[PDB]
């Protein structure tokens, strides 16, 4: 009856907060005589050291679900990749509190991965919904030659093909480049006037600097950039009038930890009440057998519903990603981020604040412009 729940948070403070949340869930709602146990380990600097420490300190402790977060350190990785891969040899589910990378969305790579935050795919979905509600039919899609950029491009193309719509062209971008002026000139030599860009912070800063000298910040150049492009040097070099996106409660790790603990407890209760549970391996060395109840626990977690969380309705997609998240449509006004609209899911409700556009124009621009230079 004794259960243990592992976790990997950012050192002592978040570990203590996770333990407090575990105790609260033990003393609230479903409260049995022997509910579960709380274990945690800090993110080690070396990925190999982190992987071996997770192995030794969690599999030997009979963990059923392990919570892992991704601290956004720019210089270092500190990614959940080693922990996810170590848990992938078995079928122990993991929860990503703030894993914003789109790599984990594919289950071919990460066999058993879950998270409570839509990495970038639902961000592209919000882009599509905003372009639909604002009547945008001319999109210049700038996509980096990386896995997350390709995934975002594929999702946007699939969403556009739903209504039999297709962008004029999708410019490719290589990370770390500095000669993107040719790509920007190609974008300028197009009928479309709105640009959707998805890149890292340094790439966003570089393309902003390149486009500043090409008169790409004038009237009619609508920008629908994402979250990574309105922070750091990207925010510093971001042209005025950017309609950026910011995820509500996506940075507050404590709320995600509490939601993950609640969902894990509910899934454990459902699994125990459903059928028998196979005991987790005593150690992570010696036994190569795959967990038989691993896929069942994954299905229970994915189908689990948590309406008492801080984000209201909490549910998982077929890829183990948060569905119907709260996105805030941010706007840049006088080099300051001004929140305008909130994305509650399949609905966009702008507030009374007026959305400004690049070039200082007050009226809403349009992507429909006739070149009148038909070659």
């Amino acid at each position, epitope marked *: 009856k004794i259960v243990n729940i592992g976790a990997v948070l*950012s*050192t*002592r*403070k*978040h570990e*203590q907060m996770f333990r407090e949340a575990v105790n609260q869930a033990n003393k609230r709602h479903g409260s049995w005589k022997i509910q579960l146990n709380a274990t945690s380990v*800090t*993110h*080690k*600097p070396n990925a190999i050291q982190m992987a071996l420490s997770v192995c030794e300190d969690l599999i030997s402790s009979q963990v059923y679900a392990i919570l892992v977060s991704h*601290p*956004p*350190t*720019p*210089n*270092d990785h*500190f990614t959940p990749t080693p922990v996810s891969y170590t848990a992938g040899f078995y079928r122990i589910p993991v929860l990503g509190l*703030t894993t914003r990378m789109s790599i984990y969305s594919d289950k071919s790579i990460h066999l058993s991965f879950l998270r409570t935050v839509p990495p970038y795919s639902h961000q592209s979905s919000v882009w599509f919904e905003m372009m639909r509600v604002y009547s945008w039919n001319h999109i210049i899609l700038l996509v980096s030659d990386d896995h997350e950029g390709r995934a975002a491009q594929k999702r946007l193309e699939t969403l556009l093909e739903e209504r039999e719509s297709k962008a004029e062209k999708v410019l490719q971008f290589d990370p770390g480049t500095k000669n993107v002026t040719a790509l920007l000139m190609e974008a300028k030599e197009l009928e479309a006037r709105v640009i959707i860009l998805s890149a890292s912070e340094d790439d966003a800063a570089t393309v902003y600097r390149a486009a500043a000298m090409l008169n790409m910040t004038g009237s009619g150049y609508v920008w629908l950039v994402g979250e990574r492009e309105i*922070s750091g040097n990207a925010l*510093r070099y971001a042209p005025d009038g950017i309609l950026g996106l910011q995820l509500i409660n996506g*940075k*507050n*790790e*404590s709320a995600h930890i509490s939601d993950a603990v609640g969902v894990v407890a509910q899934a454990v209760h459902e699994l125990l009440e459903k059928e028998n549970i196979t005991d987790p391996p005593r150690g992570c060395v010696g036994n190569t057998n795959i967990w038989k109840t691993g896929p069942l626990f994954k299905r229970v977690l994915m189908s689990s519903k948590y309406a008492d969380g801080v984000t209201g309705r909490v549910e998982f997609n077929e890829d183990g990603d948060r569905k119907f998240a709260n996105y805030s449509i941010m706007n840049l006004q006088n080099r300051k981020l001004v929140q305008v609209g909130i994305y509650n899911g399949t609905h966009v409700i702008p507030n009374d604040r007026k959305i400004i556009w690049p070039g200082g124009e007050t009226e809403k621009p349009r992507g429909y412009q006739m070149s009148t230079r038909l070659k």
Partner: antibody
Amino acid sequence: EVQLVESGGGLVKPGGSLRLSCAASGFTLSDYYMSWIRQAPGKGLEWISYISVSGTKIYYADSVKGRFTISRDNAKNSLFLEMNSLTAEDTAVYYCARDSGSTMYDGYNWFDPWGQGTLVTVSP
Amino acid sequence: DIQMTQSPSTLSASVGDRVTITCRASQSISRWLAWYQQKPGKAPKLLISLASDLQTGVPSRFSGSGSGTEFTLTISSLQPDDFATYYCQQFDSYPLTFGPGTTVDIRR
């Protein structure tokens, strides 16, 4: 300009009360977390209090727990710290600084920017 | 609590030389550490975040390194405006504590 100004310091007899006002300029106070840190002369720096954006999560240092009170006025963009039961060891230079848990992840502070600071002296 | 020890307490170096400051924590704090520069009579200013990331508006000569229990701050070229007191502060767990501090002096 993003600058902070400390005001309200002075000489207070032991056992009295004093209030410190931190002025926020160049940015909105409701968008960042604030914290008070004092620097005893001839000693290191010691973080004292922490106030969250929502105004409901308040944490005090164990050394001065139960004696200090921290309040914020988002509309006024000013920070107010209340000190009680001042002692000789409380004589330190108090600085109010801006945290970074909003833009960055939780727990990331690296307090910046720092105001010019004020000197609080306790002597009978 | 977390105890940070800085050795040496004081050091002297000439202009243009490389200065190494060692910060050692009692426990393991991964990479959660920050560096401040404090002038006499002036409030400290942040230099390095996450023990390796250079802050905006700070000269590139400042660069940190190390992780876990030992940390190192390195200045590529010492300058007259770099002579101050440096504190390594960790934000691993509450309460947030600052190191004793290291002051850069002039070797004559």
